[PDB]
Design a protein around this nucleic acid. Structure first.
Ligand code: MG
Ligand code: MN
Length: 494
DNA sequence: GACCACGGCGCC
DNA sequence: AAGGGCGCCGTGGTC
């Protein structure tokens, strides 16, 4: 490469080095661009950002997020991770991708920008002909990355003083349970230690081991095992409560307050777009897709996610997206009439534990299942309604437990992959319309979305987002969305 | 201090 | 609903 002066011309690939992975917390240590043969290294990274028109490169969405916290509208566009990930969703990291498609992922910004150019070449080449993957790329994954960049930049508001109060309460009850259990044991021990607990239950007290752990073969102390021993001994219910409280305190109540961003007053996740085997997003640092919901204490934690003052949260949930998608994929004239007729699938068919089990093993269903394994064995991958693929190679393993595990992965992906393609497309469609009404998209939770709207315009945003989500891509069966509205996530009623 | 494997468990 | 998909915690441990 011919090392050239900043700035680069239109359309260059960008490479950048961050002091850490979270773009909302990162310092920009270096910035470069590459096009043709030349590398352009920016003398001053942050000022240099202003001269870009869009982010084009490996991890584009991360640079667009950093740009966005700094006040600049720099959207991402082309990203070789996205194409690689469409080709094989086992392509999740730039290290892997680089090694696979012709480069080395290093820590130097110039070499990353170069790397980007050569990789996109090599990958856009592997997508000539793959016309459905090209479509998910142009119409879903590339535009979506702009939307997730803005969601990440915006963040969600948290009531800290509430969480600090919950924390003291919960520390008090933890103390009650732990004293309870130590006396029952006749001695004190580390209750967060599954090994010392295991000695207590099974060696010291007389209780029956029910399961062994996978990798090392210790007697399990999982919830399953403890539920099975609930009647056997009073120490057990206490341990179950202790686990519950300490899980929620260690994972949500204590750390989340400390992640509030000084400049925004909000919490900012990463929505990872190339992290999953099925085309779902993941969320990390912190994960906001696993905020508690089933227990009382869980629901009190969920009250802590709140709208800005004067706004409201708008929570929208697809009603059994996966069964409805199974109806469309399999074409079972019967299962479709069940949804088209507005009726509750769980009633017409105890039974919920067969509607949901048949995802993993009504005849067009079995037919669908069997055709899926066959095309999986033949081609080596299965696919979604939109043609997203997951390669499942052990479908022909000669060990039954591995083949059968593989079959379960193979069944699952077309339905999970499809529900995901749908939610992804629907975010892409919904985003620009929310902006037009000054509303925000805050979170995605697989088949749910959380938006924030000015109180005055909330019922109208909810009406609009519902129709957009319901009509995203009509299928033999209707997609149903439940909408809720409220001042906190629990009241909004997701 | 950073990283690790494991068991365990939060959500979809 | 979680025989599928995730990410995060503390422990016991290395380096
Ligand atoms: Mg829900
Ligand atoms: Mn599972």
């Amino acid at each position: 490469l011919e090392e050239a002066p900043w700035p680069p011309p239109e359309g260059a690939f960008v490479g950048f080095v961050l002091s850490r992975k979270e773009p909302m917390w990162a310092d920009l240590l270096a910035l470069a661009a590459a096009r043709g043969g030349r590398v352009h290294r920016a003398p001053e990274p942050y000022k240099a950002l202003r001269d870009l028109k869009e982010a084009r490169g490996l991890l584009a969405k991360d640079l667009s997020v950093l740009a966005l916290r700094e006040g600049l509208g720099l959207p991402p566009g082309d990203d070789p991770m996205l194409l690689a990930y469409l080709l094989d969703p086992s392509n999740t990291t730039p290290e892997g991708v680089a090694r696979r498609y012709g480069g080395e992922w290093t820590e130097e910004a110039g070499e990353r920008a170069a790397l980007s150019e050569r990789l996109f070449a090599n990958l856009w080449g592997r997508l000539e002909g793959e016309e459905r993957l090209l479509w998910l790329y142009r119409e879903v994954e590339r535009p979506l990355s702009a939307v997730l960049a803005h969601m990440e930049a915006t963040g969600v508001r948290l009531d800290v003083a509430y969480l600090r109060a919950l924390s003291l309460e919960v520390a008090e009850e933890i103390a009650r349970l732990e004293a309870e259990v130590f006396r029952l044991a006749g001695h004190p021990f580390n209750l967060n230690s599954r090994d010392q607990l295991e000695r207590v239950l099974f060696d010291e007290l007389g209780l029956p081991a029910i399961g062994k752990t996978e990798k090392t073969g210790k007697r399990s102390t999982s919830a399953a095992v403890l539920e099975a021993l609930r009647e056997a001994h009073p120490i057990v219910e206490k341990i179950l409560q202790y686990r519950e409280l300490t899980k929620l305190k260690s994972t949500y109540i204590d750390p989340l307050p400390d992640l509030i961003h000084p400049r925004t007053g909000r919490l900012h996740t990463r929505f990872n777009q190339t992290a999953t085997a099925t085309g779902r997003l993941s969320s990390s640092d912190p994960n906001l897709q696993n905020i508690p919901v089933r227990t009382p204490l869980g629901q009190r934690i969920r009250r802590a996610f709140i709208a800005e003052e004067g706004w409201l949260l708008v929570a929208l949930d697809y009603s059994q997206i996966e069964l409805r998608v199974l109806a469309h994929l399999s074409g079972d004239e019967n299962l479709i009439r069940v949804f088209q007729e507005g009726r509750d699938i769980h009633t017409e068919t105890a039974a919920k534990t067969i509607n949901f089990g048949v995802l993993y093993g009504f005849p067009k269903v079995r037919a669908w299942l069997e055709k899926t394994l066959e095309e999986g064995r033949r081609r080596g991958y299965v696919e979604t309604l939109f043609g997203r693929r997951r390669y499942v190679p052990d479908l022909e393993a000669r060990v039954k437990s591995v083949r059968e595990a593989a079959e379960r992965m193979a069944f699952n992906m077309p339905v999970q992959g499809t529900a995901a393609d749908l939610m992804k497309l629907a975010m892409v469609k919904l985003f620009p319309r929310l902006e037009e009404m000054g509303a925000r998209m805050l979170l995605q939770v697989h088949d749910e979305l959380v938006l924030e709207a000015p109180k005055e315009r909330a019922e109208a945003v909810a009406r609009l987002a519902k129709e957009v989500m319901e009509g995203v891509y009509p299928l033999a069966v209707p997609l149903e969305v439940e909408v809720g509205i409220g001042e906190d996530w629990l009241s909004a009623k997701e």
